[PDB]
Symmetry: D2
Subunit: 293 residues, 4 copies
């Protein structure tokens, strides 16, 4: 398998005003991430891709386009999970047929699934697809917390590579590295990249890398090299940008910052707010002038 | 329009071992609720229907079968909500064409939608379908809390009838009746039916009414009649049953109790546990003998 | 032992601007509750008494004054709990010597005590004082949740009489009445008095009964009588008042409403806001005119 | 003022079986921290000192003994906060008279204090004592969350030096350093020392430094020097020890580990479990052999 370490943008998708995928803009976002953000890979179909608001056919179309555009130039991870295991299997087979390097799956949500249910969900997608699997943990959205011993159970399936860790529990993080030193962790919070990197995460997956992937890689590499003073300066500027993005509307503002570099990054999909008001456009432009010029 | 007050079973769905819908079993469930449980209506496609684990086609087939079977004998509400607004619109159109008496929609979940996004979601479904709408509030699963003022904003759409209140905040409940006296509330927690009835809810939507509809009606009517001593005895026996069902696995145990009365209620849908372990099958038989014999 | 059923005001305390106790005002509060509010008893030293902001000497002086004033006319319960078990013991001894009819104690808070630590705390107070004990449950402030089985363990001490249930879990409440039919429950949320009464609570302990004791008795007795239409009207007016008091500052506004009836209810104790801002003084006068005139 | 940067043990207190302070053992704990753990300073009266279970007289006695034993050899910070502002002022004057280098105060808890109330509490202790003030933030115990802008308001009082940050929000941490670069942060979670240090905290306050202060200082210094690989090894061993301590009972196990080096660290104070069972003694000894031999 391709090396799955380093910087992965969580791929945003270009939507038309009616909510349909804009293929031309999606291809532009892919190309911008490869050529300009110089990412190691793309995480496709995650929360950033507005995935959970889309139909099965739409998720396939995104997987097909992203893989057609990226070809073999970078690593590609397909997030196929949802509350629907039969959909996760179907998407998982599809992305596997398309040559995606690993699958990833959000812990099933909404219903209060027991841990054995959650494990069986992972084991079923793996068995049905035969592909690698990255557990996607995002407690602040799912309300699901997985402990060290529970991760170990998940890791008994030798196709589980590790965890996309969109959590802030740095004690849990350190304990997962100690217990399962050969399993990978990708840090999911961009605004906490430096401290996650200081504990030896193997890479990161983030929304803001679609526009700030140059700083993200510096923070990651500089931390790993022990150049903490410099990584901290770059985290500080990054977090001024991120604080601004979050204040303005995270997905719409990253898209606006893409548009300001000529990427037809499109609308967001309803029920998210579909377009930035003119005041927030002006705000995004200030962020561009201050941080990305 | 049909009277939507009174006792609504939240319809359970009969699944095959492979997760496909068993139509024969699903019709037996609908018939049993109408003929034996004597419900006023069915709430179709909600959390009890295992709706969120299903594909769009499957949710349509369920709406079709339930309406095929029940025809015009009882009231029918279609829960069409989800994270996917375009799916909610499609399902609302379909259910509206089938002649469902109102739609209902879960507050959109997973992402942290703002209240104006949540309102637009309701107003969009309504506008696209032309049908009545019941707001579906289940904070314990969605993490969405709507205040009295926010319900007022929702209720400015005159096709919003009120709320399926799967919530235990009885201060909120009394305040909604005070502020919006002409808007309906259906209580969603069967184990707190009596106190909710004491505050003048217009009916109730419940998973356990599929097997305990006789008692539930009694609690409701005895409470509305001011016969609280008797209502309370029956709530106590009902809650001995409910406590048993919760410890044994909520939806599986309701299904097993149906099966024990000859209703082919089938399996649950993965990634919920698909069948009861053997000792839990036996526990279910003991609840049948103690409470539903 | 005195009958401890019925309506208990949670006693407010009159403070001077410097935070010292105003005895004259505190006696006026006790008299007003007995003579005008017609309470069955007072719950002295609980959260409404601003007890947790006070020194040991101050908590004794309050117990002394309240018992001095009320003598034997009404029932008297002393809340002596805290994080400090040795203080709870000292206060329980003192209150027991004064002739308080039962002690009560808050679950110990701040630290995350285990259930066996929590049980030992109750059993220690009981053993040292020889007096009856009411468990004081207020999860919204302490973060401590006690299950039915845990209450059973507490109730194995035969001097535990039941629970001051400042909690909204009406499933839990019905289950406690089912499992421990001879143990008492006092409802703690005044704004949900009616549904709690519908489940057979033995009385209620309330901050707002210091000014709204006439209505509260009515809701309680009308509900116990099965006259729910009338109980509900009075709960609605009571909750218009309570909503006003909460928005305006709970304890200050109850004190201002006392003051407006000539009861010198004094200041609140820092670090609570010591006095109402001027516009809030005026808001309190408008609640008086609307609801307590 | 003495330099307040670096490693501060949160001082444990030796109690007798009856709950009284054992002065001889308290002096031994102080001396062990100065001479053997080589701490920069002691944080006296915090959660680790079992402070919130003690009387005012007892808190004074601890302050008096700790200061008499330490003299001027290290920095000393006195945690004087509680729900009782008048007690916090009294303790604050006392510790100030004794020559404590700064005061610190927990955000007032139990009651849901507003932010202006919290700020006035800090401003009152400062004004009454004239001493420096370190805000003590421990959300997981108090339930109080203070945002960046709210910290800025607190910092408008030029005697506030910064924050003892017993929180895990490393985004908040990074933002406080960016907004208030001259204000100090002490990290409060020992098991997350390395990532807190990687963001430039100025020191740490922790329970486990009373026994692991040699490793703690290596992790802190090595991180600051950019020797991340080595600091991570030492954090890994430290966290094996800490995981064990927490599993066994945190305060009793640190005390047991002190006893195994000849410190008469005493009992814990009720309502905490007062003594370790013989199995947990044996467990502590294994921790000693594995990590502290
Ligand atoms: O909640 C989110 C927003 O998508 N998490 C993302 C994080 O980058 C935040 O956006 C960022 O740190 C600001 O909070 C990230 O983990 C991307 C992702 O997980 C996905 O596409 O599934
Ligand atoms: O979460 C649930 C279980 O589906 N809520 C249901 C409730 O009956 C509980 O099962 C019951 O009180 C046991 O706790 C109910 O409100 C039905 C419903 O909401 C739906 O199907 O959408
Ligand atoms: O938290 C409170 C306010 O002290 N609880 C009180 C309640 O009356 C509320 O104030 C009321 O329902 C408004 O929400 C009450 O249970 C009295 C009490 O517990 C005590 O003093 O210990
Ligand atoms: O909750 C605690 C336990 O006292 N926090 C302490 C932390 O060291 C933990 O004990 C440690 O990281 C393990 O969780 C620490 O911040 C000491 C302290 O704050 C105080 O004395 O007030």
């Amino acid at each position: 398998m391709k090396n799955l370490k380093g910087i992965f943008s969580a791929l945003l998708v270009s939507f038309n005003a009616d909510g349909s995928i804009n293929e031309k803009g999606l291809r532009q976002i892919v190309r911008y991430n490869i050529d300009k953000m110089k990412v190691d890979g793309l995480y496709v179909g995650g929360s950033t891709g507005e995935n959970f608001m889309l139909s099965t056919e739409e998720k396939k179309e995104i997987f097909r386009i992203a893989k057609d555009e990226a070809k073999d130039e970078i690593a590609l991870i397909a997030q196929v999970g949802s509350v629907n295991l039969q959909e996760a299997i179907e998407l998982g087979k599809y992305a596997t047929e398309l040559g995606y390097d690993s699958l990833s799956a959000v812990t099933p949500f909404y219903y209060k699934f027991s841990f054995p249910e959650i494990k069986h969900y992972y084991d079923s997608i793996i068995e049905a697809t035969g592909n690698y699997m990255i557990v996607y943990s995002i407690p602040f959205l799912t309300g699901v917390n997985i402990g060290v011993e529970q991760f170990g159970e998940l890791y008994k399936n030798p196709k589980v590579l590790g965890v996309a860790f969109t959590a802030g529990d740095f004690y849990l993080l350190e304990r997962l590295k100690k217990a399962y030193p050969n399993h990978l962790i990708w840090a999911g919070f961009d605004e906490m990249m430096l401290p996650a990197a200081s504990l030896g995460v193997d890479g990161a997956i983030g929304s803001t890398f679609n526009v700030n992937g140059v700083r993200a890689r510096q923070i990651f590499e500089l931390t790993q090299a022990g150049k903490l003073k410099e990584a901290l300066e770059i985290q500080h500027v990054t977090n001024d940008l991120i604080e601004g993005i979050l204040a303005n509307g995270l997905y719409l503002t990253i898209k606006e910052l893409l548009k300001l570099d000529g990427v037809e990054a499109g609308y967001c999909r309803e029920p998210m707010t579909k377009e930035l008001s003119s005041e927030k456009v002006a705000f995004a432009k200030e962020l561009k002038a201050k941080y990305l010029s």
